[PDB]
């Protein structure tokens, strides 16, 4: 394991954020800026997708391991990691999208 499921997810989601933060560093008329803003939206969505699908796969793995006190504590912790990683992705988006305009 229950410990490894929460651990493997914690790292997987953190490797997602790191890959977005760098993918974004690789990124002008009003039109050209809107195309770059779209590109950054596209990229952050792919990140939000990955984090949420890691959580789903972590959840199911645990659910397919049947304690009931530590297995419900496992999902509780994973769903909290997901909301943290999504917050961080939505803040890195809001930083880069304001940077392209400024």
């Amino acid at each position: 394991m229950i410990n490894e499921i929460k651990k493997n997810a914690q790292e997987r989601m953190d490797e997602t954020v790191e890959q977005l933060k760098n993918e974004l560093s690789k990124v002008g008329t009003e039109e050209r800026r809107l195309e770059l803003a779209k590109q950054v939206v596209f990229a952050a969505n792919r990140a939000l997708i990955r984090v949420r699908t890691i959580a789903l796969e972590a959840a199911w793995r645990l659910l397919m391991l049947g304690n009931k006190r530590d297995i419900s504590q496992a999902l509780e912790e994973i769903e909290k990691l997901t909301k943290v990683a999504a917050k961080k992705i939505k803040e890195v988006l809001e930083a880069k999208i304001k940077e392209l305009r400024e």
Binding site: A37, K38, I49, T53, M64, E79, T82, I97
Partner: protein, 360 residues
């Protein structure tokens, strides 16, 4: 640019010779478990297992007593206690049947207004919450553990006509529905009201009053001009199609708007791209994606299977080599990816099943 490549490894025609309307792989399985898929059509449910060298083995075959039943959709869940998978099936007779795949026994059943059922979806995080879309102005949320109707979505500001399709987001926090009236409607189910409705449905015991949600959290008619027959979430973005031979990628509000900050009164929409194709302008033609939402698939009315790489931004560049076979000329109603995205199954109007193994 798309890199995905597939090979047709097998095909079979089911003995009943009726159209196959639905196909779904079971994703509620561990790595190493056998790859099982369900097909629905006529009054039949058939379970198949994918094996090496393109082998497609028949596991189970279910015949409904009601010979007048015409199954259109199916969806997988699992039993909260035992963890064994369960299959929900529905179609023309307006009845949801919950089949135990070990014994092929219909254990539970639910009836809404009684109209034919278009689509079934299970909640991503709560296996007991089943979303039903029927030939009606409203959509239903069921609790299959307590056998109760949790909520009804529609009415005063619901779809003005028949709801055609609906989908949950990845975490089951919201639903996006679409219908004949050209509109797409957001229904938030992570709200205090909906969380409480769910709780009370669980707390209910004989050894029930459903919530009537008359108003959505966002609505638009500015995406498609004709009826919207298929809708799916792509992260915080929406994929949706009509009869205009394209899947539209779009989002509520402006480019930079957070989906969870979107007000019900929001009048704006942003179109991000279009997945173009041809000859798929007929009724009930569904599109699907793999677990990781890396691939988008859509079969057409002449037996051609369009695939796109969802990691590619430009939909024009995302287009993968179209999957064709000389003996596959029947309309493809639905397609299903295996949990690992290695097998792609397509089902047709002539009762044929087509297996495409991913080469690259």
């Amino acid at each position: 640019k798309c890199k995905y490549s597939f090979k047709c490894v097998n095909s079979l025609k089911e003995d009943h010779n009726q159209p196959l309307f639905g196909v779904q792989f079971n994703w509620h399985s561990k790595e190493g478990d056998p790859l099982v898929f369900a097909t629905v059509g006529s009054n039949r449910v058939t379970l198949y297992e994918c094996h090496s060298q393109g082998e497609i083995r028949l596991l189970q075959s279910y015949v409904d007593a009601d010979a007048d039943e015409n199954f259109y959709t199916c969806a997988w869940t699992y039993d909260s206690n035992t963890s064994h998978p369960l299959l929900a099936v529905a179609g023309s007779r307006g009845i949801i049947r919950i089949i135990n795949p070990i014994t092929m026994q219909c254990i539970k059943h639910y009836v809404g207004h009684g109209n034919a059922i278009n689509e079934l979806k299970f909640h991503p995080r709560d296996p007991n919450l089943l979303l039903s879309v029927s030939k009606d102005h409203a959509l239903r949320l069921w609790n299959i553990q307590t056998d109760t109707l949790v909520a009804i979505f529609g009415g005063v500001e619901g779809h003005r006509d028949e709801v055609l399709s609906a989908d949950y987001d990845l975490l089951g926090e919201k639903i996006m529905s679409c219908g004949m009236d050209h509109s797409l409607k957001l229904w938030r189910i992570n709200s205090k009201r909906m969380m409480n409705a769910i709780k009370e449905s669980y707390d209910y015991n004989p050894n029930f009053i459903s919530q009537k949600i008359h108003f959505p959290d966002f609505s638009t008619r500015d995406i498609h001009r004709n009826y919207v027959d298929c809708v799916r979430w792509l992260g915080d973005l929406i994929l949706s199609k009509s009869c205009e031979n394209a899947i539209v990628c779009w989002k509520p509000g402006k480019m930079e708007d957070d989906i969870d900050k979107i007000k019900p009164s929001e009048s704006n929409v942003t179109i991000l791209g279009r997945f173009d194709y041809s000859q798929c302008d007929i009724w009930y033609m569904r599109f699907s994606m793999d677990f990781w939402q890396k691939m988008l698939a859509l079969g057409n009315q002449v037996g051609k299977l369009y695939v796109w790489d969802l990691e590619v931004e430009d939909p024009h560049k995302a287009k993968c080599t179209t999957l064709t076979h000389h003996k596959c000329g029947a309309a493809i109603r639905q397609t299903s990816f295996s949990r690992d995205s290695s097998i792609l199954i397509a089902v047709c109007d002539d009762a044929s099943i087509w297996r495409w193994d991913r080469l690259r």
